[PDB]
Enzyme design. Structure first.
Site, PDB file in Angstrom:
ATOM      1  N   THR A   1       0.878  -1.196   0.000  1.00 32.33           N
ATOM      2  CA  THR A   1       0.000   0.000   0.000  1.00 32.33           C
ATOM      3  C   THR A   1       0.896   1.221   0.000  1.00 32.33           C
ATOM      4  OG1 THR A   1      -1.879  -1.029   1.186  1.00 32.33           O
ATOM      5  CG2 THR A   1      -1.649   1.412   1.308  1.00 32.33           C
ATOM      6  N   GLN A   2       0.540   2.193  -0.827  1.00 34.64           N
ATOM      7  CA  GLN A   2       1.338   3.381  -0.947  1.00 34.64           C
ATOM      8  C   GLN A   2       0.477   4.604  -1.205  1.00 34.64           C
ATOM      9  OE1 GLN A   2       3.421   1.377  -4.703  1.00 34.64           O
ATOM     10  NE2 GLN A   2       2.958   3.543  -5.179  1.00 34.64           N
ATOM     11  N   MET A 107      -1.475  -6.305  -2.361  1.00 31.74           N
ATOM     12  CA  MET A 107      -1.693  -5.081  -1.600  1.00 31.74           C
ATOM     13  C   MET A 107      -0.586  -4.062  -1.806  1.00 31.74           C
ATOM     14  SD  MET A 107      -4.582  -5.226  -0.222  1.00 31.74           S
ATOM     15  CE  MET A 107      -4.744  -4.159   1.206  1.00 31.74           C
TER      16      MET A 107
END
Lengths: 233, 233
Positions: A1-2, A107
């Site tokens: 996730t970013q 993810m």
């Protein structure tokens, strides 16, 4: 996730009787800072495909490296690399779509919205979209980000359904695309006046126009407007 | 001599030979005969199925790898299952990831490399089976010959197994003829049955003894056995 840092705005496209057109401005935003201006977001692959990318620029550059490798790798032990066994727009798309979905599935997405435009070997036009969620879809016109809200309504007035494709010429299409780019320049605060446009025609091949500029803008009526309600001067 | 250098695949003999590989090749020669030939529209596989007793079945020798590719085996059956399974997966990967049917030429390169690994490492053994691969891809009909040594070659026709030499000379003779059997499958098959019977000696190809497979322009790789081959005996 970013979270996206340097970003590219809309990518719009449509298909006409002999091919497809895709455009994207040359800005690389950093939040509300219009930081970079010589960013090319249209990536040509071979001479029958152009990949338009929006979203995180660092990831876009990564997808670029991937595309260059696809070309290199397809050439290996392939005597028909520039003939029957060259990369088809559909191969390039399925590949990217695969990657996009695998990454969201771990993810860790490639924060982009992508549109692959090109002409298949049998002459068929190719226009499909894929984004950071791995979601994909096709339509006579496709746009990402802001362009989805403002470009599609204009482009669909030209090609509302499949049967409008053969009735649409490169001139009509390119004109619709250029006008849409102007509209986006008016209302999108993350857009730039400079942009690139590419055409993939089953007869004329791939035409890649750089350094275009939005022209013929209406600003004169602004002089008449004063205040925000009652002010007269 | 030999006895001192044929203990494993990781040893060269004083003359630069790899006896374990050569012994594996011997398993092929001991295998029942199979033939392959192609025109410009089709590719055919004809194989002689061998039986243990007159109470046993005639072991299948043709494996379908994808709608456009398949092969015939000669030698260790299990090794054919392994290799064809790897081929089924490579064909599968190509479709799922690139929405592209795997080129027969690429399939050959992949097999060559998979076999090569079992000829340079300790602990493993070379594969003990020969394969004839036929398929129709973006460049027409194709026929490949796979040897456990890792050598894969593209031919118009060929044969492997016991007494294969007969059928092979026949094809090398009939060349100019069958290579033109375009648009007519029955002829190509008959031309194949004729080539294969050039290696008979024991008996004559019967109904539950003959096995044929074809693939082409508008023909998905399909296998014919028994009553289905009656009209060719």
């Amino acid at each position: 996730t970013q979270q996206p840092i340097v970003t590219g705005t809309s990518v719009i496209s449509m298909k006409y009787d002999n091919g497809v057109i895709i455009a994207a401005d040359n800005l690389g935003s950093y939040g509300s800072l219009l930081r970079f201006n010589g960013v090319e977001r249209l990536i040509p692959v071979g001479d029958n495909t152009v990949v338009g990318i929006s979203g995180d620029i660092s990831d876009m550059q990564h997808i670029e490296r991937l595309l260059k490798d696809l070309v290199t790798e397809n050439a290996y032990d392939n005597p028909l690399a520039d003939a029957e066994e060259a990369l088809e727009p559909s191969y390039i798309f399925e590949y990217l779509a695969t990657v996009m979905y695998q990454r969201r599935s771990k993810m860790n997405p490639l924060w982009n919205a992508i549109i692959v435009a090109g002409v298949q070997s049998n002459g068929d036009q190719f226009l499909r979209y894929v984004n950071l969620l791995g979601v994909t879809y096709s339509s006579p016109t496709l746009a990402t980000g802001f362009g989805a809200h403002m470009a599609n309504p204009l482009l669909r007035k030209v090609v509302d359904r499949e049967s409008d494709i053969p009735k649409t010429t490169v001139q009509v299409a390119e004109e619709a695309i250029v006008n849409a780019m102007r509209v986006l320049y008016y209302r999108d605060a993350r857009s730039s006046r400079n942009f690139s446009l590419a055409i993939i025609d089953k007869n004329t091949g791939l035409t890649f126009k750089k350094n275009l500029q939005v022209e013929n803008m209406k600003w004169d009526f602004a002089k008449d407007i004063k205040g925000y309600g009652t002010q007269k001067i | 001599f030999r006895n001192n250098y044929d203990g494993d695949t990781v040893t060269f003999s004083p003359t630069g030979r790899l006896f374990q590989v050569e012994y594996a090749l011997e398993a092929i020669k001991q295998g029942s005969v199979t033939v392959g030939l192609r025109s410009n529209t089709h590719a055919v596989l004809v194989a002689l199925k061998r039986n243990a007793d007159e109470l046993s079945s005639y072991q299948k020798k043709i494996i379908k790898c994808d709608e456009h590719m398949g092969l015939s085996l000669a030698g260790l059956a299990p090794d054919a299952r392994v290799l064809s399974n790897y081929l089924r997966q490579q064909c599968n990967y190509s479709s799922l990831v690139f929405n592209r049917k795997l080129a027969v030429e690429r399939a050959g390169h992949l097999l060559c490399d998979k076999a090569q690994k079992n000829t340079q490492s300790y602990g493993g053994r070379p594969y003990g089976v020969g394969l004839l691969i036929i398929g129709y891809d973006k460049s027409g009909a194709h026929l490949l010959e796979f040897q456990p040594s890792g050598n894969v070659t593209e031919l118009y026709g060929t044969a492997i197994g016991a007494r294969s030499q007969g059928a092979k000379t026949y094809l090398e003779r009939t060349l100019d003829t069958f290579i033109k059997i375009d648009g007519n499958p029955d002829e190509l098959i008959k031309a194949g049955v004729e080539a294969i019977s050039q290696s008979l000696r024991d008996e004559s190809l019967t109904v539950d003894n003959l096995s044929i497979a074809i693939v082409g322009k508008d023909t998905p790789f399909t296998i014919y056995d028994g009553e289905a081959v009656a009209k060719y005996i």
